[PDB]
Design a protein around this ligand. Structure first.
Ligand SMILES: [Ca+2]
Length: 346
């Protein structure tokens, strides 16, 4: 399968919260993971709050998944040690908590140490950069940084440095990533990423690599821009690794000012449409750009954000249907799958 075609991780996000996508219940999904991939990311159950039950740490459910991975030929990318969204904040992660810095330290020290030897790499900090599309509280930019509870408590971006240093100390063997989205657009956020990563390097922070989520559409952003954004980050350091962490590809672009090039019906791309064929080319050109500009020895992996289309967080988005992944609703490989094969094989 796909993983055989590369010497770096070829991964997939797996569900474990019930319903049809749940990896523990779906033998068909289990079989795809074993045959095609050699790494998993937990789609949800390694987020911050999932490390607790009531007031105590609780690793039961995440240990089950990490063990499943080890028994079925998968390494694990941990997602994520520090991330702002309130649906996954531990209760300690509040401006009302005088003990915040102590509880932050305890979180990273405990979680990183717990998974040592079982988890290959981590998203240490995810989504520290400001994004206008993603600022529901209206706090605004602090010179490109998101003013999350971590930023507010630490009074600035020093929480990022601390998270990396603590993760390194707790598990010296893990590869430590900074992860974000929209940084492949080669616009304002890419610039803010350069500033963020340069500051960490200047401070001697133990960052091992940068993750690009790569939640893209079929035609936007341009492959030239994706390629140049990656190049800009590769150029910051002779060793910094690059990982594509959450790749998926929407056929529909609701942001293009054109409502006549949208597939509006679930039947449109059930069998065949121009969009599925472009999606093949799109997966292919992105994997090719990754290979061309990320040197051998610095390729941290490529991961797709789920197994089959109905499992995708983007199966519906902006009130439209979509088909974002490598396998269809009946778990059959799509043209997208072949695009990855062709890229990885040259
Ligand atoms: Ca459109």
């Amino acid at each position: 399968g796909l993983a055989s075609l590369a010497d770096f991780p070829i991964g997939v996000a797996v569900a474990a919260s019930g319903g049809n996508a749940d990896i523990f219940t779906s033998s068909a999904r289990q079989n795809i993971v074993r045959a095609e991939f050699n790494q998993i990311t937990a789609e949800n159950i390694m987020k911050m709050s999932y490390m607790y039950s009531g007031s105590n740490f609780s690793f039961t459910n995440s240990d089950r998944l990490v063990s499943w991975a080890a028994q079925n030929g998968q390494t694990v990318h941990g997602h994520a040690l520090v991330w702002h969204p309130s649906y996954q904040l531990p209760n300690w992660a509040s401006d009302s908590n005088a003990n915040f810095r102590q509880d932050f330290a305890r979180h990273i020290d405990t979680v990183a140490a717990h998974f040592a030897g079982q988890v290959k790499s981590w998203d240490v900090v995810n989504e520290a950069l400001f994004d206008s599309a993603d600022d529901p509280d209206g706090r605004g930019s602090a010179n490109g940084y998101r003013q999350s509870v971590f930023y507010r408590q630490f009074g600035g971006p020093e929480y990022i440095d601390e998270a990396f240093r603590r993760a390194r100390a707790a598990d010296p063997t893990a590869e430590l990533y900074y992860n974000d989205f929209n940084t492949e657009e080669n616009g304002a956020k890419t610039t803010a990423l350069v500033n963020l990563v340069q500051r960490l390097l200047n401070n001697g922070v133990p960052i091992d690599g940068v993750g690009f989520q790569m939640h893209v559409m079929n035609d936007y952003p341009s492959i030239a821009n994706i390629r140049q954004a990656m190049q800009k980050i590769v150029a910051l350091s002779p060793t910094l690794k690059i990982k594509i962490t959450e790749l998926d590809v929407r056929l529909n672009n609701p942001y293009d000012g054109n409502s006549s090039n949208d597939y509006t019906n679930r039947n449109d791309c059930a069998v065949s449409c121009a969009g599925l064929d472009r999606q093949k080319a799109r997966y292919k050109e992105i994997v090719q750009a990754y290979l061309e500009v990320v040197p051998p020895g610095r390729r941290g992996g490529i991961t797709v954000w789920g197994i089959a289309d109905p499992d995708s967080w983007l199966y519906t988005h902006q009130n439209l249907p979509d088909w974002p992944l490598l396998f269809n609703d009946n778990l059959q490989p799509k043209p997208a799958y072949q695009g990855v094969v062709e890229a990885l094989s040259g």
